[PDB]
Design a protein around this ligand. Sequence first.
Ligand SMILES: Nc1ncnc2c1ncn2[C@@H]1O[C@H](COP(=O)(O)OP(=O)(O)OP(O)(O)=S)[C@@H](O)[C@H]1O
Ligand SMILES: Nc1ncnc2c1ncn2[C@@H]1O[C@H](COP(=O)(O)OP(=O)(O)OP(O)(O)=S)[C@@H](O)[C@H]1O
Ligand SMILES: Nc1ncnc2c1ncn2[C@@H]1O[C@H](COP(=O)(O)OP(=O)(O)OP(O)(O)=S)[C@@H](O)[C@H]1O
Ligand SMILES: Nc1ncnc2c1ncn2[C@@H]1O[C@H](COP(=O)(O)OP(=O)(O)OP(O)(O)=S)[C@@H](O)[C@H]1O
Ligand SMILES: Nc1ncnc2c1ncn2[C@@H]1O[C@H](COP(=O)(O)OP(=O)(O)O)[C@@H](O)[C@H]1O
Ligand SMILES: Nc1ncnc2c1ncn2[C@@H]1O[C@H](COP(=O)(O)OP(=O)(O)O)[C@@H](O)[C@H]1O
Lengths: 548, 562, 546
Amino acid sequence: QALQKYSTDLTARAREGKLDPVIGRDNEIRRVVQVLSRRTKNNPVLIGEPGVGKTAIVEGLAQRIVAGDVPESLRDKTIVALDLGSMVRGEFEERLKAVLDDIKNSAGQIITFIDELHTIVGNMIKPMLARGELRLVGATTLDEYRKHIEKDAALERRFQQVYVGEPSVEDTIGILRGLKDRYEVHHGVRITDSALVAAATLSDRYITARFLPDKAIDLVDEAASRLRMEIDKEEVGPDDIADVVSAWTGIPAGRLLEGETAKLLRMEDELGKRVIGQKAAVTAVSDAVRRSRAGVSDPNRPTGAFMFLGPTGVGKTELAKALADFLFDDERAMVRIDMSEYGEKHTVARLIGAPPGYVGYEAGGQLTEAVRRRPYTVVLFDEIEKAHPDVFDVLLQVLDEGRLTDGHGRTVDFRNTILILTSNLGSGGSAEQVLAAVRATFKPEFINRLDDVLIFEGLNPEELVRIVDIQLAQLGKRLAQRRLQLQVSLPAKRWLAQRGFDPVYGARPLRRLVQQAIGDQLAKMLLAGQVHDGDTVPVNVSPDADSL
Amino acid sequence: QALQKYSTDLTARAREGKLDPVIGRDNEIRRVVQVLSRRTKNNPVLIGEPGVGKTAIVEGLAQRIVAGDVPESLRDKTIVALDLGSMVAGSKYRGEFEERLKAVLDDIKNSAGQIITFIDELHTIVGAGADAGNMIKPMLARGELRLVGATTLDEYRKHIEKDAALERRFQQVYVGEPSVEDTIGILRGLKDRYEVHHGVRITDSALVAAATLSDRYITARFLPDKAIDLVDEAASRLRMEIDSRPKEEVGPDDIADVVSAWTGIPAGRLLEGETAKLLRMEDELGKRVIGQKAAVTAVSDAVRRSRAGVSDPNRPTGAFMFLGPTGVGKTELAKALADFLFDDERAMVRIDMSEYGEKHTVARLIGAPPGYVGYEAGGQLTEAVRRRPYTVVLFDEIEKAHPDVFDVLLQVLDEGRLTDGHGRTVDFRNTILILTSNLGSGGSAEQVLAAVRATFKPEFINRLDDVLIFEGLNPEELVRIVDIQLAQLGKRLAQRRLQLQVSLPAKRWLAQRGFDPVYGARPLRRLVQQAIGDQLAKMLLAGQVHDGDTVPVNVSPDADSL
Amino acid sequence: QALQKYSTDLTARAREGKLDPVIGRDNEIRRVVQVLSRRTKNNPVLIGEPGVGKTAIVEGLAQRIVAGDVPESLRDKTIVALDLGSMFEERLKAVLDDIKNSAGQIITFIDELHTIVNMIKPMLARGELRLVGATTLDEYRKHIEKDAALERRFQQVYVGEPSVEDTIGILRGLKDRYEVHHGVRITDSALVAAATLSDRYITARFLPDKAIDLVDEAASRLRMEIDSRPKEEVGPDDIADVVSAWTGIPAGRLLEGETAKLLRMEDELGKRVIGQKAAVTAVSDAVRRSRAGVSDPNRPTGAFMFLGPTGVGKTELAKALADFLFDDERAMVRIDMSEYGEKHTVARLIGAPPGYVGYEAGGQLTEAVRRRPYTVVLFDEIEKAHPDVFDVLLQVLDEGRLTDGHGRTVDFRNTILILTSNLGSGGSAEQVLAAVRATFKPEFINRLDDVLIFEGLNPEELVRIVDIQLAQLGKRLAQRRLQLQVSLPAKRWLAQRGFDPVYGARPLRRLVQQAIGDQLAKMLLAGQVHDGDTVPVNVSPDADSL
Ligand SMILES: Nc1ncnc2c1ncn2[C@@H]1O[C@H](COP(=O)(O)OP(=O)(O)OP(O)(O)=S)[C@@H](O)[C@H]1O
Ligand SMILES: Nc1ncnc2c1ncn2[C@@H]1O[C@H](COP(=O)(O)OP(=O)(O)OP(O)(O)=S)[C@@H](O)[C@H]1O
Ligand SMILES: Nc1ncnc2c1ncn2[C@@H]1O[C@H](COP(=O)(O)OP(=O)(O)OP(O)(O)=S)[C@@H](O)[C@H]1O
Ligand SMILES: Nc1ncnc2c1ncn2[C@@H]1O[C@H](COP(=O)(O)OP(=O)(O)OP(O)(O)=S)[C@@H](O)[C@H]1O
Ligand SMILES: Nc1ncnc2c1ncn2[C@@H]1O[C@H](COP(=O)(O)OP(=O)(O)O)[C@@H](O)[C@H]1O
Ligand SMILES: Nc1ncnc2c1ncn2[C@@H]1O[C@H](COP(=O)(O)OP(=O)(O)O)[C@@H](O)[C@H]1O
């Protein structure tokens, strides 16, 4: 008791009850008390993620001790904690000597407890430990333990691992409903099982950074404190927590609800807000994605394997960029891999990378290393017609079983991704020879496993005004730093169509063609004068070109 | 008062009887003595792979000194357990560890030559520098202190042999691991300590079974403690089972229970229920593999022999290669087997030999030599098998990889050996290698048994076991195949509450269309999908179908309909 | 009660009404009290940068406490502070005894507790003192980030710096304290000028304090110029003046002589770079769209890469760019990406982390851009570097900052980024297009400006190059006063002879040297061409005599 100033007790304060009961996880306690009852390789170590209940388990064991249920060997033996962030160059070993000598002259079996000892281990506790007078019960995380206790240890022969992965939704619900009254007297508002389960499921699904047993308690206590402060509604409810989750992540409370009906019914113009025209294609793709997640298709298949070809610049990619945006909440998800370099027989191994020990190994394959991470992407395939007739075997293997093999040896999974095989075939035919050319060029049976093979319909000579109109609505945001508004006039706006189409690349220059013109033609006025932040900047169609 | 707070007295500890009774190893104690009794440079160092008892010899020497069984110039020497973890620990100044080390050395050399010293794990002697662990050499190479040490092979080579002028002052005593008989002796010697600690009893048959199993199934650690740990584990488990629960001694099958409770190997003596399952195998496997009566008996007999106790302990549990016409159920038989003895279809290690048409692609299942790109990662197959040493290896369609990959299996088989990049070795002694093919393609048994000979080599066909040939799909049993497929579909339709009322003519037309003689039952799952699943999907999201309805099917004159 | 001297009070000052002006951040105060009235992860800390007003945050918290908008457990809570000017370990026990023995009613506020973290850890383990603090992000991340013992009792609360509309009233509340020393008038124009000028350009300090120091130095400058040799009030002029004298980046209304040069950049730069009309147009449109305030606020004010055939001007253009903005060539940061042939050379431009041999040396890029953050960086031969520095540049683009070994963050939102290479060198347009798309990933080229292409030299373009080289040689051998006399036939002869359209202009320098300097240096050491002389040259049948 001489230097008990860097150490807290667990049984003394247990004699008062300032701890929390840890109902659940009764296997781990039995495993630990069994390990601690051996003769060699005793003093186990708790291995698990941060925020899972390791301290909870050791406290539950402490409470079972103070009650008295364990074998009388372990009975009548106290526990003492330690905090290492208080010890830490030097004199850390001096205080280590002090505490170890204290334990040693205590002359008993007073168990210790050392949290995150991966900062402690070194050679100073092994001569103490391989003698049988002290019992240390530590804790750390999996990969960290694999670091400090495997390379420089040579001590792992005297440490026994114990695994505590994570509780489930149903278990953390029981945990919450056990730990409810304490807060109903801390603040005291009211609690609803609907609120508890909503917190559990929503945290599990959307707060993908922290973990369950502490993550749920954090949100619940935060909502309770907010609703106690709000009195500056005497209950907490599902909305009373969804508001907090929305404030936390950024996604509003609306979309944080039922994710099947109210989502698969949003396959409407919500796409057409980014894509223009091609409503037939949007409808076909929406039906394909709706029926795919019904729950009757085979569980090993891409979530969609359709392709679309024809004229460029119509927004072929734009459909996919909007599609990934709506589904996976990001448009920086699709990955475009051109099928141009893959015109050689040998280069098919570029998108995998076969051997360990050859040129391209560490970089991985172009396709897999960009899929095994972020398994939610939307892969694109430009000019699928120019790829050698050997990658199509790879594609077959993809859309015949939702998995593939890289070179490292890993297995990449494709059962919740979307394939899109763009092209440029069909330059002359409307709907009669384009399908015949697609049948003849590709293997006519490989196409069978594909979904709808729709062709994008051309842009109406009128329906360029809508695309350029979204373009103008966008570029209106550009000069929001000086609030200089812009003009609109059908002659000027339609003047962009016949002079910016150039029907070989569709509408790719239609952004630069107008942005450089208007921006850099007004950029001198923006420094000289002639405008302030209420002026329509009336631009007109001069006899030849677009001056102001 | 110098070596009083940096050292204990191992001799006095042994006098207090609190040490373990070493049994055997008289050769090494005699060698250590006849080295420690030299004139100059008398410092033995016990060397050997970790776990084999490199300290136990020093405790034995201490016990022998205390008892008085040593030569004339070795009596009453009081060997000392020195330590450096508590000398270099608290010192933050210039030249402070030196005063402590010099005080210890001075206290040694003042007394007569009767303070024989013992530093354990002396690979911690070269550091402490910043000229440390190096001022000791002038006293080492003159016979002033004795310094019995103990270090592992790896640490020795890595830490000392880089300091040659210091290694000269040492002598090596290669402490090799003991054999099974010596292990049984040691275990029988130590039995009483655990029998007293845990209030249970331990049987000699249990000790023998422990010393025999711990050598055949845990091939990563070493014997004299690898065995003892099992006895301790089983004693503790029996203690816990006795207590806390309102024929009280360990048995020779509780050890098998432990050594199967980890490493996954089902090693045992056929406890009840297991024998019922094994006897009930050919039929229990038939519910997933209709057809192929000849093959199932062979694999079943292999498993039976392997688990009954009559099989060569150093060779795989079977190396079958079955081949036949396309779409007959080869891969499916393998998967059904793995599902039988694991109930986990994704717990086997299949590798697709269709990818290895190139020569150099073999490196994925071996690794890379030292000094190349992927070296510390290992080999795919070797890594997958080093853990889970009970899987069912598969070689999908081994006819593509050109005849060089046949020169690794050539010794994987018949020994269960393989060596990856780091130079390790793995054991395939309790796996079931299975490698399909498609040689033949229509030809009779004597037109495909020529393809095998002209494709492989005698050194290869001689390795593997019976070359099972698969028959063709009988035109009748396809009704049961369609039955299986509809059962799997109904199993997929369980999140909802749907059932099916499949009619006999519909089932007949199904088994009739999509079994073309060249491809077997392969175009059946896709047909079932495109004729039931999509038709239902177009019919469920648009009303007119709801969960609970026992959906019937019809045999309309056109393609099948509801 | 025995803490009144070692620690000041915020309960007496609350009633006595004297308080620094507080405005806004009421939602932050509400968040503070909401997290204070919790059971776990209570008593937060403040994260930010120097010049937020976090002491002001807790002061407004105290004023609202004494006014009364609190929950039931906050009967004025008598919040206090712990003076770090109270600095052995024996006094601290009794100093903390009053806080411990309290009912959690004299909770303290440890301003800048970053380094305090032995004694207070167990004293906090029981949940009796709040010790709400105020620190910064760097100190949070280097001090209290990895320790899992204390991250269970601290829930950070981020703060927003730029609040121009309220900084107006802040100045209104602080203008008085500077009109007494400086007998000057800082008009409302000066208030809203300090508010809306130094934010985007002087992003080295922060708005609430850099704006205070701006008006402070402006009032000092005005009281200075009041005397004999230099206006009677601060307006929109002295503010911009002080904007210029900070970090070198110029930013005002207009320097009344810079608007002409900027309109004339293309023409002025054509006398040092020759040809490349598209290139000069694009490189000119890039800086004018920035100096006027049109460009986007979170981006380097210039970043693009060009390539093509050799000997065309890919480096000369960037060198002229460094010339026309700083008036000297040495004011360019140039690092050649050729030596970065291995992976582990990333720390050469980043600095090795604490604990290794070269630790105080610092990087080669981040250290040169941290101080004086306006120069132009030249990444010569970017194609040669290991394809991992490309990932650092990935962060650099569209984000505008990077971290080095010590853990500090530097800014890149006002510099120019030049990268060059010669990918392909034989492909006309499509080969090189696919090559640049394939060597760098499309997610890195996405962010860039136009990737330019240089076209190559032609006959009409080489006579001007010859004239430039001859003027340069004159400038060189002017210090022996041997000014040249060259004939137009010889000029055209050189421009014709050195023309080959595969190497560009370097053969022209080679020919100039080997043709003139040979004979000139032969004569100059044998006499007869002594100083103060004018040598003629004339086209001989093959050579050109002197
Ligand atoms: N089964 C449980 N019963 C009671 N409380 C639990 C349970 N599981 C988790 N908790 C609580 O969840 C919180 C997590 O505490 P910790 O045990 O420290 O977390 P951890 O997962 O063990 O990792 P650390 O220690 O936070 S790094 C504590 O408030 C526990 O009381
Ligand atoms: N001949 C023996 N007689 C009695 N017990 C033995 C004998 N050999 C080994 N043991 C026991 O087996 C275990 C071996 O432990 P140690 O020899 O102390 O470990 P070690 O040999 O020092 O190996 P390292 O390098 O320290 S991991 C102990 O439990 C010993 O009691
Ligand atoms: N006797 C059988 N019992 C059950 N399913 C069978 C049987 N014979 C064939 N099948 C089915 O036939 C299909 C093809 O079986 P697989 O074994 O996967 O093909 P395969 O044997 O690998 O032939 P190849 O040469 O590899 S294409 C699967 O859907 C099996 O379920
Ligand atoms: N348009 C130009 N204007 C002025 N000097 C030029 C021009 N083009 C080439 N030169 C000269 O020719 C030489 C080429 O200079 P650099 O720009 O360094 O070469 P480069 O064009 O960058 O090609 P590389 O890839 O760097 S070798 C220098 O001596 C320049 O002065
Ligand atoms: N339906 C559309 N909706 C919105 N923008 C479009 C649409 N079609 C074309 N665009 C514009 O035209 C450009 C060309 O799109 P895209 O088809 O991806 O080019 P490419 O033909 O090179 O694939 C896009 O940058 C986009 O801004
Ligand atoms: N919102 C505000 N309005 C007026 N004056 C303020 C405001 N915030 C702070 N101040 C005053 O200006 C100074 C800002 O310095 P300080 O608060 O120490 O910066 P930091 O928050 O970085 O520590 C304070 O001394 C305070 O008296």
